Structures are given as structure tokens and as C-alpha cells.
Paper text:
The NA is a homotetramer and is classified as a type 2 membrane protein. Each monomer consists of a cytoplasmic tail, a transmembrane domain, a hypervariable stalk domain, and a globular head domain. The globular head domain of each monomer contains an enzymatic active site, whose activity plays an integral role during the viral replication cycle. In particular, the NA cleaves sialic acid residues [name] newly formed virions as they bud [name] the viral host cell surface.
Here, we generated stable soluble recombinant NA constructs of the N1 subtype (A/Michigan/45/15 [name] [Mich15] strain) using the baculovirus expression system. The constructs were engineered to contain either a measles virus phosphoprotein tetramerization domain (N1-MPP), a Sendai virus phosphoprotein tetramerization domain (N1-SPP), or a leucine zipper [name] the SEPPALLATA-like MADS domain transcription factor derived [name] Arabidopsis thaliana (N1-SEP). The measles virus tetramerization domain-based construct, termed N1-MPP, was chosen for further evaluation, as it retained antigenicity, [name] activity, and structural integrity and provided robust protection in vivo against lethal virus challenge in the mouse model. N1 NA expressed as N1-MPP resembles previously solved N1 NA structures. To verify the correct conformation of the N1 NA head domain (residues 82 to 471, N2 numbering) [name] A/Michigan/45/2015 ([name]) in the recombinant N1-MPP, the N1-MPP was first expressed in Sf9 insect cells and purified, and the N1 head was obtained by removing the MPP tetramerization domain [name] N1-MPP with thrombin. The [name] [name] of the N1 NA head was determined to a 2.90-Å resolution. The overall [name] shows a typical box-shaped tetramer and resembles other published N1 structures, such as the N1 NA head [name] A/California/04/2009 ([name]), with a root mean square deviation (RMSD) value of 0.28 Å for all Cα atoms. Ten residues that are different between A/Michigan/45/2015 and A/California/04/2009 ([name]) are located over the outer region of the head domain, where residues 199, 247, 263, 269, 314, 372, 389, and 432 are solvent exposed and residues 240 and 321 are buried but have similar hydrophobic residues. N1 NA expressed with this tetramerization domain was intact and resembled structures of N1 NA that were previously solved. N1-MPP and N1-SPP exhibited high enzymatic activity, comparable to that of the positive control, N1-VASP, which indicates correct folding of the proteins.
Author numbering:
A (entry chain A), B (entry chain A), C (entry chain A), D (entry chain A): 82 to 169, 169A, 170 to 306, 308 to 333, 335 to 336, 339 to 392, 394 to 412, 412A, ...
The structure:
Amino acid sequence: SVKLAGNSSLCPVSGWAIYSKDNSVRIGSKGDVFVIREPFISCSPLECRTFFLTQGALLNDKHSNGTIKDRSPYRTLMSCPIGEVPSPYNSRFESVAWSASACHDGINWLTIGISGPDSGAVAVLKYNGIITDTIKSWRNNILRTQESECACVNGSCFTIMTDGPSDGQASYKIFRIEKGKIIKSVEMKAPNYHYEECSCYPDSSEITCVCRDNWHGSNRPWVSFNQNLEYQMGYICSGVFGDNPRPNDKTGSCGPVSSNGANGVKGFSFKYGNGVWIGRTKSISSRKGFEMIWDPNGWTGTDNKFSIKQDIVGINEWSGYSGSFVQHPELTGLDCIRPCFWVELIRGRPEENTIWTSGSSISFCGVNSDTVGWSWPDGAELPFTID
Amino acid sequence: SVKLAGNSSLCPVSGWAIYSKDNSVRIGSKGDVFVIREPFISCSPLECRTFFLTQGALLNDKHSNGTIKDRSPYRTLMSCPIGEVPSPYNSRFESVAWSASACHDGINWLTIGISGPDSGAVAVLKYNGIITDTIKSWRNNILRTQESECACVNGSCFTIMTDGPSDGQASYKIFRIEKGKIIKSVEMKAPNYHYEECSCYPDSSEITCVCRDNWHGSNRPWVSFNQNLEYQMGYICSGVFGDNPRPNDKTGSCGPVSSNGANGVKGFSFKYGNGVWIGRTKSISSRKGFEMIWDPNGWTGTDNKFSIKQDIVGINEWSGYSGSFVQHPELTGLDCIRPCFWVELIRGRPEENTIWTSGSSISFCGVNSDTVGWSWPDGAELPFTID
Amino acid sequence: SVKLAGNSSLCPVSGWAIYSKDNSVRIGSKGDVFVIREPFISCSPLECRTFFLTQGALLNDKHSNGTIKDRSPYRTLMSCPIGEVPSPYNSRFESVAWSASACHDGINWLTIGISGPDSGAVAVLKYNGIITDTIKSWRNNILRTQESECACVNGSCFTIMTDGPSDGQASYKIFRIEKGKIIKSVEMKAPNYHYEECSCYPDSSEITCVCRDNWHGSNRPWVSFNQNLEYQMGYICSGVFGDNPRPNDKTGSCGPVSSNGANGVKGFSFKYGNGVWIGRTKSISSRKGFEMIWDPNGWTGTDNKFSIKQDIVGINEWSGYSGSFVQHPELTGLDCIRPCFWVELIRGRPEENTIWTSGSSISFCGVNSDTVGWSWPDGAELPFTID
Amino acid sequence: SVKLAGNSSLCPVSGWAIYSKDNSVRIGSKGDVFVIREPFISCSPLECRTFFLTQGALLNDKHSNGTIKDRSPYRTLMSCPIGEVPSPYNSRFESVAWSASACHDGINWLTIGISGPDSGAVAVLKYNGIITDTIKSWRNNILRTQESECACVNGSCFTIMTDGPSDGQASYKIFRIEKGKIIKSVEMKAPNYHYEECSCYPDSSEITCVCRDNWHGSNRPWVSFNQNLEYQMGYICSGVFGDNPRPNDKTGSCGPVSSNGANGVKGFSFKYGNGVWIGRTKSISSRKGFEMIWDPNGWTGTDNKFSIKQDIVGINEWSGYSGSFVQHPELTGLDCIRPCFWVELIRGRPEENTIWTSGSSISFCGVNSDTVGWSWPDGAELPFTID
Ligand SMILES: *[C@@H]1O[C@H](CO)[C@@H](O[C@@H]2O[C@H](CO)[C@@H](O[C@H]3O[C@H](CO)[C@@H](O)[C@H](O[C@H]4O[C@H](CO)[C@@H](O)[C@H](O)[C@@H]4O)[C@@H]3O)[C@H](O)[C@H]2NC(C)=O)[C@H](O)[C@H]1NC(C)=O
Ligand SMILES: *[C@@H]1O[C@H](CO)[C@@H](O[C@@H]2O[C@H](CO)[C@@H](O[C@H]3O[C@H](CO)[C@@H](O)[C@H](O[C@H]4O[C@H](CO)[C@@H](O)[C@H](O)[C@@H]4O)[C@@H]3O)[C@H](O)[C@H]2NC(C)=O)[C@H](O)[C@H]1NC(C)=O
Ligand SMILES: *[C@@H]1O[C@H](CO)[C@@H](O[C@@H]2O[C@H](CO)[C@@H](O[C@H]3O[C@H](CO)[C@@H](O)[C@H](O[C@H]4O[C@H](CO)[C@@H](O)[C@H](O)[C@@H]4O)[C@@H]3O)[C@H](O)[C@H]2NC(C)=O)[C@H](O)[C@H]1NC(C)=O
Ligand SMILES: *[C@@H]1O[C@H](CO)[C@@H](O[C@@H]2O[C@H](CO)[C@@H](O[C@H]3O[C@H](CO)[C@@H](O)[C@H](O[C@H]4O[C@H](CO)[C@@H](O)[C@H](O)[C@@H]4O)[C@@H]3O)[C@H](O)[C@H]2NC(C)=O)[C@H](O)[C@H]1NC(C)=O
Ligand SMILES: *[C@@H]1O[C@H](CO)[C@@H](O)[C@H](O)[C@H]1NC(C)=O
Ligand SMILES: *[C@@H]1O[C@H](CO)[C@@H](O)[C@H](O)[C@H]1NC(C)=O
Ligand SMILES: *[C@@H]1O[C@H](CO)[C@@H](O)[C@H](O)[C@H]1NC(C)=O
Ligand SMILES: *[C@@H]1O[C@H](CO)[C@@H](O)[C@H](O)[C@H]1NC(C)=O
Ligand SMILES: [Ca+2]
Ligand SMILES: [Ca+2]
Ligand SMILES: [Ca+2]
Ligand SMILES: [Ca+2]
Ligand SMILES: [Ca+2]
Ligand SMILES: [Ca+2]
Ligand SMILES: [Ca+2]
Ligand SMILES: [Ca+2]
Ligand SMILES: [Ca+2]
Ligand SMILES: [Ca+2]
């Protein structure tokens, strides 16, 4: 076991090849499957796992009632092997949490699970499943984190957290964590920015985060930083708007695009020089569909011209959160960091006539060989017996 | 693999950070979950496990009928990873038992499971799952033990057992066990004391046990001893009464507090010099709620003044047994022994209109970083389909 | 990994301490548990497992219908950890089989699973789960074997098989197996003897088998042999008759006791010089109850006087097959071979108004410390929802 | 870990000894079992696994509806230990796929899972579960592969794929894969041949594939090649026709036998000089029954005379796909490559009045010791509760 270097560059990719699909809600129709949301993938040097926040209940059970609510004392962070349904019989317990992050530094797992009341939430940090540190809300307004993987470089793992209104300017801090212990932190000087649910990846020894602006931006804000938490911020300039909801594609902005900027969805993007791989919903108003768009100058250009589009989920099928995850050369044997992504396909409320809300997941990896667009939807036919 | 030293002191702590929550009864509403009671946690140098006494039946099944009864030939001691529901598909069989203890000496697991009729019960000792010794009732009145973890120091593990009335003076013996073999035992000279269900931990090479007085004490009795079974006894003097039921807090006693002293609940406390961390119910009459109270002079002072209170379970929510467990530096890499505790949240009879009784569990670990009180209740809505 | 020596003597024992109980049929009331019969235990140098012949169906399912039938193409030999219920989610597949044996030689598992039609059955031998040899029926009348563990000594494992009438004289052959390969075999010259379902154990470098006489003996026949298959035969002389059905205890015979000698039950006994540990049913006509009886001269004496009786299963509770299993010093660290036994508790047909038949299991190990009799019954209340 | 040599010859065999039977559909009657088809076995140097294409649904669940359809975005390739039912609680996720192959090169697993629309399918190659390469349809007509194990020799694994009409001449390419990376490929010059679902095995450092002619041949086509993809092609000449449907046995052809040549079934055969071990259906019109036939000159002779027939599945019981798999000497310790085969027993549509289609599996290994014919059918009684 050797700590991840995190010193190679992102691998340029031409398309996305399908990696996993769990069919959790269909299997959950009769079988014993957790009610979950906020799934995300993270890999160790040996295996890849699906992390998820359960609601402490099973599908098609009465306790799945009201699971449109995001936070409660019953939600717990657990994990299972990629592609497998999150079941009590195959899942590892990670932490009690309604907001989370996780990553492997090359030696052991780091987990961050937030509980503590909305009035004063506390993040529980675990290293190899043992509590190693905590950090409590400093704004008393729903302390919250990535809902995707943290990024690790040379024995250090890095993440972001938000505390404050999701309806206005809040406070965002970046953390450097070593062996589950917070080593240093910094408050961003980001007036008029909004950061939530960052999807972060390492690239050439530094970390880049693409996040969600729930306040007033339909493009995605980003933050990049070195190991000392020296930061840079901005918004993706491409007119290929990445958030949901959003306007129809047009001339973009290097600042928050106010039109349809309120609310949003967790998402991701990969920066390549002036170019960007953008993952987004197909519908501009609800989380339907999913597509990957290559915009060769979208990081810095405000135009709406792109070069490649790959279908991921059909436009009439439900989608949801999406996030980045990487496979390090220590795992793959490649000479660069492999970009991958996962997609949450949310079924039930608020779009469907159920008493419950849960998601399935699909994942893809970036390749330079041939790929094809298709639709890999959840595919469950709702409602269920419980309704 | 190296035997646990057990030679460092307890880590002083400022609050308790949540470690696990299993939601067993809610998940058990439809899924396959054991009917259990008397859960407790114990860790090896590599992992932490939840031990429990099953009743040999599943939740929401007819065989869960009458599970308010504590002893029967169907109850068995099994274990699973922390935070996971006790299921037949993820649980390791330990012993046939209606009273139990368990611990890791640094090399392998020691288990103690009692069966034998109330007229003549026999404790089955297992080391690495192999029977290594037995000890039979010497008073012919329900031989019984900790229902929490034993304590290990330098290759020796130590525990307590009771035989006799729970309605009056009984007989209590302390045991030194090495590799599952009883090495030495001693009968306490404890007239007017009552010891049941001790929660024991090691501290600076000696073991301290905080127990339950079911006869006539609403404060908790304690016993401390060295490796040779040289013992000291007393009651926690703090007016913060730790047992349940109990009187309202007032001036305490260094002897058994007779007021509301009958009956009780398994509990724990951590001794720090003259100070004590007290875990107790919030209601004085039924096992509702749970709270942690720091009484800087409560071990030896009879006053009711305390310095810190941390909410654990809301006052209107059901609780139950609680017990100590430790994480040794051999596991954590710390330079002191980490205090933790678990809480059993009993649902069903006798408080609720069910045919069955079972519990879920939550656990916390002591830290010096920021924490917050909240309520982490079982959260199942009873009754169930079976009723 | 070192091959088992098998060169120490049996450990003298004073009582039997309970080792495992699975509660399979009660748990199977709702949960997913195999329909099984003929369970038996065998240990490796690291773990102990329950082997069993499934009927390829689950409890409380329509496919459990008619499972009173012993042989069919759907029965398979599988195994799980001791004490755990045989479930599709925790069970290892061993072989397709309606008659079986298994053992560990110190290096890997040997399995023997018989299929082939009653007209021509074929035993499939597996070593580390890989087919290594076969042997087909030589009498074309239900080739069958121990239904308990084989015995291993210095890299060789030994067993017995029967082919022919169970209503009269049949043919019995002893096998020496090395790494799953039959090395040598011999046909017994046993006129007027009947051998079925031998429970075999090693003792001081030789193997002893206690079996079932289904033809005309209510005492148990035995066979002992060295590694070259040089054999000795006889019947246990004790008037403590070990088979079921059987007469009331009286003066025994060193030959087959004709009274109530027809039919029988798989059983076991441990030979100690002229003494014997006898396990038997409590009822003389049906498989109810179970008890352990020490008859200090019962191997060679025809009297009915015994010294010790230990209750195992109450007289009004259903029992069934019983068999020997040993724990070798290579596993325990003892200086002798530990005698243990298991009991099958058959529920359903033919004694109960069900459509199905299945069993649970209990097991005990011999000790010289204090023990107690009790009753550890199956405890399920029949019939079930399927009936 | 050492790469498989693949340099020994096939072991001559006299009969087939039963190796596994999963009873998946019967167990699935109540328990949680995947809807699957196209099962196949492949072994590593340590274990043997059942691979299968799920339909992302469970038996006796509404989502099993319409599972007669072969391709959809919900089907995924997963695996479990041999003999165990494919369940979400014991199955490893492999790939998203409606057509598949898998094999172990001695070091790690190679998986090939095809998705991409019928208009442009993409094969996802995984090595140790990590995507290593892709190949997309070149004829835009359902890119498809073996549905059985690939063959590995000296660090290289080899397989076949088809693209084009199954109603006429299509295009077939052979691939050499090293560590999950396609190293070289070649298009066959096979006018008037048709290759689908090849069952491939290594033999004396070269690979032989026996396949399915869905266009116009009732005998099976074959392809053999060395490591450089230098190929030879033909049809099995034996009048023992191997495909289904097929004519009654008569004088065969070394070319495609046009009579009843349309449609077919995945199958296998083992070439031994001029001889052949033929596995086939018992019915000539539907996939009923299964039998093994030794035709000592059937590879090159057009006659219908054979020497050995072994019953595998009774003529009135449902069967389906069959395929080859081998156990290498690296696993067995033998001095030759062991021939084995598996059989899929399809239950439900289109032969039975259900809403669903799924299969169980049986497997056998070639031996020179005594064997017997019998019938090992699926044995489930349909329809089920869902219908
Ligand atoms: C998922 O959660 C939903 C939210 O709680 C549940 O809906 C709730 O169901 C409860 C119970 O039926 C209901 O409570 C009240 O309102 C009822 C009318 O809507 C009313 O009938 C109830 O009271 C009457 O009956 C009781 C008992 O006889 C009397 O004591 C009362 O005096 C009165 O006569 C009660 O006032 C909620 O209204 C309802 N909520 C919503 C939003 O609809 C779902 O049932 C639940 N699903 C599952 C599967 O558990
Ligand atoms: C959990 O255990 C509880 C305790 O055993 C069960 O309650 C028991 O249910 C039984 C069976 O119904 C019942 O037995 C007797 O009393 C009945 C009235 O209470 C009476 O009706 C029964 O006898 C009558 O019917 C039988 C059959 O027709 C006749 O042979 C009799 O002559 C008579 O006509 C019988 O006397 C217990 O009373 C009852 N116990 C309690 C404490 O209520 C629960 O049913 C059980 N739950 C589950 C889900 O299994
Ligand atoms: C476990 O297995 C048992 C043994 O098979 C089952 O019992 C069997 O149930 C079948 C089906 O009901 C039954 O078959 C015949 O006999 C019936 C009377 O006993 C008779 O009614 C049946 O035929 C009639 O109905 C059919 C359909 O309408 C007509 O085609 C016929 O012409 C006739 O009108 C049929 O002759 C067996 O008798 C019965 N066996 C025994 C021993 O009782 C159990 O049902 C089964 N349990 C489960 C849960 O599967
Ligand atoms: C497995 O899949 C099968 C294929 O989809 C299902 O069969 C389908 O069931 C649906 C729903 O019942 C049915 O849809 C239509 O046709 C019905 C008559 O066959 C018709 O009654 C339906 O419409 C009527 O009712 C609706 C609602 O009240 C109205 O809006 C309509 O205007 C009309 O009044 C509808 O047109 C399919 O016909 C049917 N398909 C087949 C091939 O039979 C199975 O139900 C399914 N099984 C399970 C367990 O899910
Ligand atoms: C990446 O990290 C490794 C391991 O520390 C180091 O040896 C190597 O120089 C780094 N590679 C590059 C290209 O900087
Ligand atoms: C604790 O135990 C270790 C291991 O035996 C020993 O080396 C060390 O001296 C002890 N530490 C203290 C502080 O006594
Ligand atoms: C038992 O076997 C061991 C291992 O082969 C051998 O060394 C030893 O001499 C034997 N013991 C006795 C008492 O014969
Ligand atoms: C088979 O392969 C091994 C390993 O590479 C080699 O040493 C051996 O010569 C080969 N055997 C034969 C018979 O060619
Ligand atoms: Ca937005
Ligand atoms: Ca652009
Ligand atoms: Ca269930
Ligand atoms: Ca008390
Ligand atoms: Ca005080
Ligand atoms: Ca007899
Ligand atoms: Ca006697
Ligand atoms: Ca179920
Ligand atoms: Ca054909
Ligand atoms: Ca021929």
C-alpha cells in the first residue's frame, strides 16, 4: 500500500464507455434494497465502491414514507461494491449522515458524514472506519459537503463544505485532511458566488472542483486550489449551461448567469485547458435525460458551439444528481488520471405518484476508443405495491 | 497480532461524536432481521463488531411472539459488523446464550455465553470460536454476566458474574481469563451491595466496572480491580443518579441510594479522578431518552451540580440498556484508551402494543473536538403487520 | 497448512457443553432458508462448518412439497459456518447429492456426494471443490454413505458405503482416500451384519465407526480399521440400546439384538476401552428427545447399568439423526482429539401435519468441566403458512 | 499467480460426472433470485464461477415481465460461485451487457460485455473489473459474442464476435486479447458459413471453437486458430447433428446441412483427432432433454454411428443453451486440460404460460471413471404466483 501520487494529468477522452448499472429500484420492487439518494463512486487502489446515504428504510416498505425529506436522524452513509444493489446483506456501514463525502488516499478510506442539527450540524470524519476528527457548523444553517468523492494527493485529501443560505450568499471553506485529521482550512473570499455539492478531482498534483450554484447561477461555479489551499474561483464560461434548471443554450458568462439560476442540481465537469467535458440534463426545467458534451473552448469561451454530444439517458427518462470520480494510475496502471462519472436516476417524489423517493445509478468511464450514445434509464414502472 | 497492552489511561473527552446507527427495527419491518436484545460493541485491533443475543426469530414473524421473555433455549449470541443490521445473511454465530460477554485480547476473540437452566446455568467460554472452559451456577438462581464487553490487559481478559436473587443480596464473582481459560476467580465480600450487568473498561493497566443495582440502589455500584483480582468497591456518589428508575437529582450517597433503588437498567460511567462521565435515561421512571452528563466531582461528591450535558436521545423516545466499549490504541494509533458507549433502543413490549420486543442500537465515541446534542431515536412506527 | 496427524487419543469427557444451535426452521418461517436434512459438522484446522443436503427448495415455499422423499435430482450438498442458517446468501455449494460425506485432511476439503439413479448411483468425490474421482453402485440398490464426517489420518481420509437392501443383508465397503482419489478399498466379510450411515472418528491413528443396523439390530454395529483397511467388526454390547426404534433397556448382546431391530436412526458412540459414550433418543419408538449416557463397561458388557446421563433434548420434542464430529488438536491446541456430536431436529412429516420435512441442528462438545442437562428443541410451532 | 500455459492436450474422457446444479428457478419461487439467461462457467486457478446476463429483475416480480426479450438497457453481466443461485446478496457485478464472454488468463479476470444499440453496439472489455478497451459494431446489426468462456493461452485470451444478419451471411471476426486490450483482429473469409455463440476451448496451445449456424446449418460450424489468428474453418461432419432444431440423424455433411438448418441453439463439442464428444438436445424440434454422444469418427465421418450415449436431461424436460468450459492443470494439478460443460435449463416463455423467462444451470466434468446417465431437470412447477 502506497499513498496516491495524484501527480499525472487527466487523460483526454473521446467518449464515455458504460461501467456500471445497478437497477436498484427495479430489483427493490420485491427484494431487500435500501432507500437511498446521493449515491457516488470512489475507488481504492484495489476496488471501486458505490457510497450512498440511506434513509434507514427499504423500498416498498412503509418506512420509505416521506423520504423526499433530505435530512433525518435515520439516514446513514453505507457502501457496497460497484454495480451491486445497496442491500443490508452486502453493504458496509460507514457513518450516520445526511450529507457526505469519501475517498481513499492510497492506504485507507476517509469518510466524512454530517449529522448535528440544522442548527449546529457536526461532520464526523472516519479514517479506516475510526472517528478521527469533527467539525461543527459555523453558520448554524445546514452544514453540508460534496455528496461525491474527495480528492487525494500525496497523502492529503481535500474537500469543500457550505454553511448558510442556499437562497443567498453562504460561506464556503476548503479543507486539507491527512489520515482523517483536518490539517488546515480556509474561508473563501467569494462574494456573489455560491458553492454546493462540489464534484472534485485531482489533476497534475492540484485539485479542481465543479459545483452547484443554488442561488443565482445556471452555469456551474468552480474552484481550484493547490495543496496549501491557495485557491482560484470562477464560473464555467461556456454557453452550454451545465446546471438544471437553466436557460436554453446561448452566449454564456464567466460570472453567474442570472437567468434560471435559482435552484440547481449536483453536477460535474472536467477542465482541459480552455476545453471542458460538460455533463448535464437534457430537459432545461426538470432532471430528465443526461448527455455528455465536449466544448473545446467552453471553459473560457462564452459561445454555445460544441464538438461532441453523447447520449447517456433518454430525454423522457428521469435523472438526477451527477458527479465526478476518478480511477488513479495506481489502480489502472495507466500513465494519467482516468476521468469517470456517475449518474443518479431519481424515481418517486416529487415527480411521480409515490410515497417514497430513491435512486439508481449508472456510471461511465472516459475512453479514446469507440463509444455510442444510448439511454440507460432506471426502468422501473411506478407506482409500487406500497404505492 | 500482539496482545493488547491496556496500559494507557482513558482519554479525557469534551463531547460524544456519533459513531454508528443501525435502524434495525425499521429495516426489519419487511427485511430479514433478527429479534435481538442486549446488544453491545467490542472491537478487535482491526474491526468493531456489534454482538447481540438473538431470540432465534425474525421481526414481523410469528416466532417473535412473547419475546419479552429474557431466557429460552432458542436465544443465541451472534455478531455482525458495526452499523449493520443483525441478519442471518451477514451475522457470525458465536454461542447459544441468554446472557453474554465478549472481548478481544489482541490475538483472538473470547466469548462467554450462558445457558444451563435457571436452576443450574452453565457459561460456555469460546476462544476463537472454540469451547475452552465452562463454569456452572453456584447459587442455582440465573447465572448471569455483563451483557457488554469484557476488558483485556496483557493477555488477560476480566469479567463479572452474578448468581442469586435480583430482589436481594446475591453473590458476585470476578474472573481472570487467559485464552478462554479461567485462570483465577474470587467471591466479593460485598454485603448490602448488588451487582448486575457490569459495563467494564481497562484503564492504566487495571479494570473498572460500573454496574446495575437491581436490589435497592438508584446510583450505580462500581468495582475496580488489578490483574490479581484484588478488588475495591463502592457506589458512585454523584447526585446525578445514573440508574433507571431513580429519584429526581438531589444530594447523593456514596452507598446505595434506597429511594427508587429497586429494578434498574444496564448502564455505564467513566471514572476520571474525582470526576465522572454519566450516561443515563432522561425519564426517571421508564427508559425514555438518553443524555451524557459530565460531573467534574461526581465520583466522590454527593452534590447534583454538573458542568456538561449532551443530548443523545429525545426524552419522548424509547431507550434501554447502555454500555461501555473502548477502542484501544492498538486499533486507533492514539496514545490513550478511547472511551465510547452504545445505546439500546428497545421497541415493542412492555411499553408498546406489540407481541414482540427488540432493539436497535446507536453508538458514540468520546472526542475533544466539537460535538452537538440531538436525538437519534429508533424511529420505527409501531405496531407492525404481525402487530 | 499441515496434514492432520490423527495420532492422539480421544479426550476423556465428563459432560457435554453446548456449542451451536441454528434455529433454522423458526428463522425459515419467513426468511429464506433451505429445506434440508442429514446435516453434519466437520471442522478444518481454522473453522467449523455445517454441511447439509438441501432439497433445492426453501421453507414455507410450495417447492418444499413432498420433501419427505429422500432422493431426487434437486438435492444438493452445501455448507455454511457453524450455527448459521443454511441460506442461499451464506452457503457454499459442494456437490449434487442425496447422500454425502465430508472432511478436511489438514490441507483442503474432501467431499463425497452421491447421485446416479437408485439403479446405478455414482459418488462424486471433490477435493478443494474439484472432481477428483467417482465410484458407481456395484449392487444397483441405492449406493449410500455416512451422512456425517469422514475421518482423516496422515493425509488419508477414510469412509464407508452401503449398497443393497436396507431390509436384509447388503454389501459394505471401506475406502481409503488421499487428496480426493480412492487409493484402496475392501469389501467386508460381514454376514448377518448391517451397516448404514456410519459416524466415524479417528483415535490413536486408527478409525472407529459406529453405524446403523436397519435390518435386525437395535444396538449399534461398529467397525474399526487401520490405515490399510484391516478391519474389525462387532456390535456394541451395552444393554443401553443406542438405536431407534429399540426395546426397553435390559441385558444386551454383542451381536444384533433382534427385538425392534428393524429400521433405525443414524447415530454415534465413542469407544473408551471397555466404556462407551452413548447418544440416543429418549423415546423407544419415535425420534423424540435426546440424551447422553456414559456406560463405563458398555462396549463389552451386556448389562444396562450406566453412570452418567445428560439431558440434551426433552422427551416430548422432536429429534432425528445424530452423528459424531471431532475437533483435532491442530485446530484446538489440545493434546488429544476432542469428541463432539451434532443432533438433527426433524420437523414436519412424517410426524406433523405439513407438506414438508426439514431439520435444525444443535451441537455439543465434550468437556471435563461442569455441564448441565436441559432441552434445546427446534422450537418452531407448526404448521406454517404454506401448511 | 502465473499465466495459464494452455499447452497440454485435452484429457480423453469416458463419461461425464455431475459437478453443479443450482435449482435457481425453484429457489427463486419465493427467495430473491435474478432473472437470468445465457449462463456460463469459467474458472480461475483458484475457483470456478457462474457468469450470467441478468435482466435487472427478480423472479416472481412484475419486473420479470417480458423477459423473453433478449436485449435491453437493464441487462447486466454478473457472477457468483458455482452452484449458488444468482442473487443480489452473493453476486459480483461484472458489466452492463446483453451479450457477453469471460475468462481468466491465470492472473486476473477478463470480461467482455456488449451494449450499444442494435444500430451500433459497443463491447466493453474489463480486466480485473477495470475498463481496458472497447470495440463497436462494424455492421450495425447486433454486435454479439460467445455467451461462454473465452480461451486463454500464454497471457493471451481469444474470442469470436458476429455482426450482421442471423438470417443470412454475416461477418465474423476473431480477437486476440492481452490484459483486456485487443492486440490483433482478423475478419474471416467464410462465405456461406454462419458463426454465432461460439463455445471455445484451448487445446495443445491452440484454440478450437464450436458454434451455432443460425442461417442454414443443422450441424455445427467450427473454427480453429493459433495465437496469430491464423484460422481454419469447417463444419462437424458427423451425422449426429448437434444443433437444434435439426433433422433426424442420418448421413451428415462436412458443409452446412441445409435441412432444418435455420435457427439453432448455442452448443459445444470437443474435437479429439477424428473423434468428437457431441452434446445436444434430445428433441429435434424444441430444446428438450440433453445427451452426450461419443462419435469416434464424427469430426470427419458423415455416418450416424456412435459408440457412447450418456443421459443428462430427460427428453420431456426443458433445456436450452449449452457451452464448453475447461479446468486448467494450473487449477486441477492434472497433466492435461479437463473438458467440462454446462447446460442452461430455460423455464417460462416461450414454451410455458408465464410472463417471464429464466434459466437454471447444471454442469458436468469429463472423467474416465464410472458415470451414469440420469435426468437433472430444472424441476420447478410453473406457473408461479406472478404467473
Ligand atoms: C405515509 O405518511 C403519511 C403522512 O403521515 C400518511 O398519511 C396520513 O395518514 C394518517 C392516518 O390515516 C392521517 O392522519 C389523520 O388524518 C386523517 C384524514 O386524512 C384522519 O382520518 C385521521 O383521524 C381520524 O381517525 C382517527 C383514528 O380513528 C381519529 O382518532 C381521529 O379523531 C379522526 O377520526 C388523522 O387525523 C393523515 O392525514 C395522513 N397524511 C396525509 C398527508 O395524507 C400515510 O398513511 C403514510 N403511508 C403509509 C403506507 O404508512
Ligand atoms: C402469540 O402467542 C399468544 C399466546 O399463546 C397467542 O395468543 C393465544 O392464542 C391461542 C390460540 O388462539 C389462545 O388459546 C386459547 O384461548 C382462546 C381464547 O383466548 C381459545 O379460543 C382457544 O380455544 C378454543 O378453540 C380451540 C380450537 O377451536 C378449541 O380446541 C378450544 O376448546 C376452544 O374452543 C384456546 O383455549 C390463547 O388464549 C392466546 N393467548 C393469549 C394470551 O391471548 C397469539 O395468538 C400468538 N400470536 C401469533 C401471531 O402467533
Ligand atoms: C403438494 O403436492 C400435492 C401432491 O401433488 C398436492 O396435492 C395435489 O393437488 C393436485 C391438484 O389440486 C391434485 O390433483 C388431482 O386430484 C384432485 C383431487 O384430489 C382433482 O381435483 C384434480 O383434478 C380435477 O381438476 C382438474 C383441473 O380442473 C381437472 O382437469 C380434473 O379432470 C379434475 O376435475 C387432480 O385429479 C392431487 O389430488 C393432490 N394430491 C394429493 C395427494 O392430495 C398439493 O396441492 C401440493 N401443495 C402445494 C402447496 O403445491
Ligand atoms: C406485463 O406486461 C404486459 C404488457 O404490457 C401487461 O399486459 C398489459 O396490461 C396493460 C394494462 O392493463 C394493457 O393496457 C391496455 O390494454 C387493456 C386491455 O388489454 C386496456 O384495458 C387498457 O386500457 C383501458 O383502461 C385504461 C385505464 O382505465 C384506460 O385509460 C383506457 O382508455 C382503457 O379504458 C390499455 O389500453 C395491455 O393490453 C396489456 N398487454 C397485453 C399484451 O396483454 C401485463 O399486465 C404485465 N404484467 C404485470 C404483472 O405487470
Ligand atoms: C509521480 O509520483 C511518483 C511517486 O512519488 C514519483 O516518483 C514521480 O516522479 C511522479 N511523476 C511525475 C511525472 O512527476
Ligand atoms: C505499554 O505497553 C508496551 C507494550 O508491552 C510497553 O512497551 C510500554 O512500555 C507500555 N507503555 C507505558 C507508558 O507504560
Ligand atoms: C503426532 O504427529 C506428529 C506430526 O507428524 C509427530 O511429530 C508426533 O511424534 C506424533 N505424536 C505422538 C505422540 O506420536
Ligand atoms: C507447458 O508450459 C510450461 C510453463 O511455461 C513449460 O515449462 C512447459 O515446457 C510446457 N509443457 C509442455 C509439455 O510443452
Ligand atoms: Ca442553479
Ligand atoms: Ca464553445
Ligand atoms: Ca423478504
Ligand atoms: Ca436500581
Ligand atoms: Ca457534582
Ligand atoms: Ca435398528
Ligand atoms: Ca453397563
Ligand atoms: Ca423475501
Ligand atoms: Ca441451425
Ligand atoms: Ca460416426
